[PDB]
Amino acid sequence: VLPGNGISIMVNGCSGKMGKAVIKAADSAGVNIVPISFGEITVHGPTEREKVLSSVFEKHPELIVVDYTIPSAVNDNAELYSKVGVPFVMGTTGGDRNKLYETVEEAKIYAVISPQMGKQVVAFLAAMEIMAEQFPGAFSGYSLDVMESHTAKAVISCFQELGVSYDISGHAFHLYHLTSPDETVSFEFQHNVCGRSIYAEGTVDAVLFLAKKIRLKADQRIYNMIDVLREGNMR
Amino acid sequence: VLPGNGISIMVNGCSGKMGKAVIKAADSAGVNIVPISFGEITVHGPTEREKVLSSVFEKHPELIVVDYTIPSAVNDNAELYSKVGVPFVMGTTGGDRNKLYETVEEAKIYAVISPQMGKQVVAFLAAMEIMAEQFPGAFSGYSLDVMESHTAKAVISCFQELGVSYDISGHAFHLYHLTSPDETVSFEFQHNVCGRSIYAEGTVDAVLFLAKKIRLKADQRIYNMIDVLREGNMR
Amino acid sequence: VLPGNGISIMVNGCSGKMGKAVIKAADSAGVNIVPISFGEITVHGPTEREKVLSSVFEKHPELIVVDYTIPSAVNDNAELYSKVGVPFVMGTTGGDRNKLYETVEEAKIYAVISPQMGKQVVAFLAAMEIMAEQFPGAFSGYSLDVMESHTAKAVISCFQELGVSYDISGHAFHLYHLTSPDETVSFEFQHNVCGRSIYAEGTVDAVLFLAKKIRLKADQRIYNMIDVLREGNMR
Amino acid sequence: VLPGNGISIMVNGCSGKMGKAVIKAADSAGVNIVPISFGEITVHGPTEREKVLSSVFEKHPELIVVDYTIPSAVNDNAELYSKVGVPFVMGTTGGDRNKLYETVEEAKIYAVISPQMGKQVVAFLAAMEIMAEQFPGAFSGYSLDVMESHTAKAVISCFQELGVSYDISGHAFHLYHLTSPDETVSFEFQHNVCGRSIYAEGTVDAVLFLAKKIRLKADQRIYNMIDVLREGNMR
Numbered sequence: 002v003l004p005g006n007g008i009s010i011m012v013n014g015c016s017g018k019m020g021k022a023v024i025k026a027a028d029s030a031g032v033n034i035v036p037i038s039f040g041e042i043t044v045h046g047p048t049e050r051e052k053v054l055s056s057v058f059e060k061h062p063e064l065i066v067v068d069y070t071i072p073s074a075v076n077d078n079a080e081l082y083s084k085v086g087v088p089f090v091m092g093t094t095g096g097d098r099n100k101l102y103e104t105v106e107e108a109k110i111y112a113v114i115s116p117q118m119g120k121q122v123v124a125f126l127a128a129m130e131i132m133a134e135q136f137p138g139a140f141s142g143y144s145l146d147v148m149e150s151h152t153a154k155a156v157i158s159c160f161q162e163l164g165v166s167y168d169i170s171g172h173a174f175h176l177y178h179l180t181s182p183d184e185t186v187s188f189e190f191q192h193n194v195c196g197r198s199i200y201a202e203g204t205v206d207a208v209l210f211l212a213k214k215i216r217l218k219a220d221q222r223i224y225n226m227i228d229v230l231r232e233g234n235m236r
Numbered sequence: 237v238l239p240g241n242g243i244s245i246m247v248n249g250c251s252g253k254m255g256k257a258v259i260k261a262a263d264s265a266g267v268n269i270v271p272i273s274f275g276e277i278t279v280h281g282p283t284e285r286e287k288v289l290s291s292v293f294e295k296h297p298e299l300i301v302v303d304y305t306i307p308s309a310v311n312d313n314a315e316l317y318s319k320v321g322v323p324f325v326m327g328t329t330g331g332d333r334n335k336l337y338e339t340v341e342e343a344k345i346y347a348v349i350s351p352q353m354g355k356q357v358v359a360f361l362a363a364m365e366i367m368a369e370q371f372p373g374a375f376s377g378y379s380l381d382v383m384e385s386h387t388a389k390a391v392i393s394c395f396q397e398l399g400v401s402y403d404i405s406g407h408a409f410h411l412y413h414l415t416s417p418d419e420t421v422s423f424e425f426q427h428n429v430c431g432r433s434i435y436a437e438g439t440v441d442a443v444l445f446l447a448k449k450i451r452l453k454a455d456q457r458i459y460n461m462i463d464v465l466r467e468g469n470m471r
Numbered sequence: 472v473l474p475g476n477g478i479s480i481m482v483n484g485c486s487g488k489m490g491k492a493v494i495k496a497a498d499s500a501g502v503n504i505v506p507i508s509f510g511e512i513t514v515h516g517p518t519e520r521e522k523v524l525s526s527v528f529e530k531h532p533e534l535i536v537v538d539y540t541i542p543s544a545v546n547d548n549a550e551l552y553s554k555v556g557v558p559f560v561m562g563t564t565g566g567d568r569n570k571l572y573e574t575v576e577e578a579k580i581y582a583v584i585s586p587q588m589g590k591q592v593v594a595f596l597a598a599m600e601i602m603a604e605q606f607p608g609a610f611s612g613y614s615l616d617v618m619e620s621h622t623a624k625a626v627i628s629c630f631q632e633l634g635v636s637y638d639i640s641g642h643a644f645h646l647y648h649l650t651s652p653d654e655t656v657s658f659e660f661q662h663n664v665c666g667r668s669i670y671a672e673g674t675v676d677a678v679l680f681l682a683k684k685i686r687l688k689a690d691q692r693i694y695n696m697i698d699v700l701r702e703g704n705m706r
Numbered sequence: 707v708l709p710g711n712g713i714s715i716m717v718n719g720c721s722g723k724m725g726k727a728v729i730k731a732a733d734s735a736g737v738n739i740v741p742i743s744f745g746e747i748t749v750h751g752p753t754e755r756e757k758v759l760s761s762v763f764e765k766h767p768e769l770i771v772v773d774y775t776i777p778s779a780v781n782d783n784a785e786l787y788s789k790v791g792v793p794f795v796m797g798t799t800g801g802d803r804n805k806l807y808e809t810v811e812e813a814k815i816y817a818v819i820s821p822q823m824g825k826q827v828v829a830f831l832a833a834m835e836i837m838a839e840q841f842p843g844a845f846s847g848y849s850l851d852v853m854e855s856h857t858a859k860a861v862i863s864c865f866q867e868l869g870v871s872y873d874i875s876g877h878a879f880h881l882y883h884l885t886s887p888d889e890t891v892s893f894e895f896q897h898n899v900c901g902r903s904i905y906a907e908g909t910v911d912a913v914l915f916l917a918k919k920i921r922l923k924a925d926q927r928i929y930n931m932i933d934v935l936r937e938g939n940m941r
Binding site: 120124125128136137140181187188189190191192194195196230233234 | 354355356359360362363364366367370371372373374375376377378399416418420421422423424425426427428429430431433434465466468469471
């Protein structure tokens, strides 16, 4: 019995390398994928939007849209989902973020919105944010050195809250090096991603997460990746 | 105005390389160090224990003992502090741990007891324990590889709680490597300590922490390093 | 003036993810790519091999074949190149390696044969082999720990020659950790590859290398990646 | 049969933390240590230098001096050894280096002079220098990032010779990170030392090395750590 069993997604972003990875991952999970898309699959022109989508959501009431698109399209693509009344999971970056949440909360529609869908990265982030809030000053006097490439903005925000001083594509690489005042203690965290699979699997995870909240007819309609993580592994 | 200003410690362990590091660190903090010790400083024979110590604690009511000693001496050295009524900070390992806490709670005496006093290591531990409890399963399917040398037992306990599979001297070294199922994501944590300075500074930290709880006449008498970390930097 | 300027390759392996990366890299270098292939490009059936290829090599005398194929095809695909008399660069693994060199040396034909074409990896290898031969025993008594994933067989051969004790897809990851006897010294080497671009660029490098040896009418006909590295950067 | 068996050293630097580590290491190797010293052991005033030392070197013809001292004392302490005619191993930094070699080559006296005595560090250096000279340009276009603390000047000299772009106490730490142009390949070297034991053991190694060259009545009188490494492990 697959866990995606009984769930359908529409993947608006079918051509992007991200969209593909999502398709691959959803297919593994047993999530069925409807063969229509927007701006094997039949892609659709950017007119007649409501009617194509309303009639899919009518034919597939278990449908959840996945949106991985363009910052200019966010506020537009969200105004569409809310008028049709279909839940969605959106990891796209950009747009009037305040207007985008406004749109969805007036619609009382169900959604997961997180510009970052690598759920393992989020967890490490959240730990280092809990640590910074629970144990203020614990690393007072330590220095931080960073190497990166082409997210780490919160990480430095935490280490400052912890008392430290400091000055989607293929690969990503992050290295953070904590040194003690007398330089006799070093901590080092290092992070390598090759591909977008980690983001796919987290998108699928939000999907499965969000199907459950719909089914349970939950009162909160809008969720983030931390919400997803707290539910536990649904796989 | 130093923060150790107004605080005195007796360092039972004056000859151990640890004891020295504590002395060095306490001296930096402005903590005054009484020149008597047990089993520059005048070391004392293991008889007449109560009287030597009672008359120091009478002469120095702001005294806090620091104990870094032998596992066989723990339950004995604690029964002494409680009869004199002097607060202590004990990082020694071993002994009947249940009998040792029993001894101190009957005395209603003030103490910090943590076999691990590198407070930065504790914080990382606590983050990874919060993460494991808040986000069950977040790393389901990841494999863990470990390299070590001559603590990491909880770390593997967490990563199992997070869904992962797996098979005091001079230096210490720990490396932990998390790999994703498709092996396209890696996290790596690495940890090097050279010396005992990190433990000294944390012992001093518990001391300053514990002076405050005494002064404030706090109701809880027995604390651990997590308690110390939650107070914030006192330096 | 591109450095691939004036050079043509045929890429037998046009469909493999490796073959693609080679095409991408050769295109950057200015290497022209003929649109025929074997077992945009027109792929050809596995019969009439000599005639198709003889007439390309007649039409394109500056042609160099690149072969990234199947171990069963090595000894066969090499017997073809030698009868036509066309230089090739082959990174495929497998086959009767002794029979494969026999085939080419009787033909007195020009070739680069290296199952490993990431030239940067080869260099590190060669350094650690020079070190092992020049400085026998230099790491006598050090221990070696290794983490890997899905090459490192020589690396351990070296470190044994240096006195140490020990027990093509998307990503690759290698970590090697040298620890001193008293465990107060650690060296750590770490190696991450995401993609096949590094192998492409080295294949192209052998190509440019081999065009020069042909042009200069050099007496040695068969080369490896070390030969390529000693020539210097040709880019 | 210890390998230091039959060899005696005088350790001018008996009080420095380095000198101690050397003593510890020489004692392990079976090297006998004479109980006189300069500027258990009896330390000597800085006058009557020649006579004290001439009469030790007369009483102990197998003596080899080890010098770990002050830059101002180098040129002076070397002029002393040469007039007495006693071999020495000197890792001290500073002084007129040209005048210091001049002094020793006129004396035709036997010596090892290397400001760096961690022989394992030297080996890695020499490999990366062989690599830079044998394979010019091999890392053309790679970027280099460096983290350090309180040597690496040659390392960057090599990586520039390899085509890369770039902008004695307790602990030491070095991390070097090589990234490919498309950022899909990373190499990382990392280096941690805690203590001076690694330098001691290399000093002892030069000593044993130098006893052999004396015994064999070798024609070259002045050696470096590379010479020591090429002999092989003498332990």
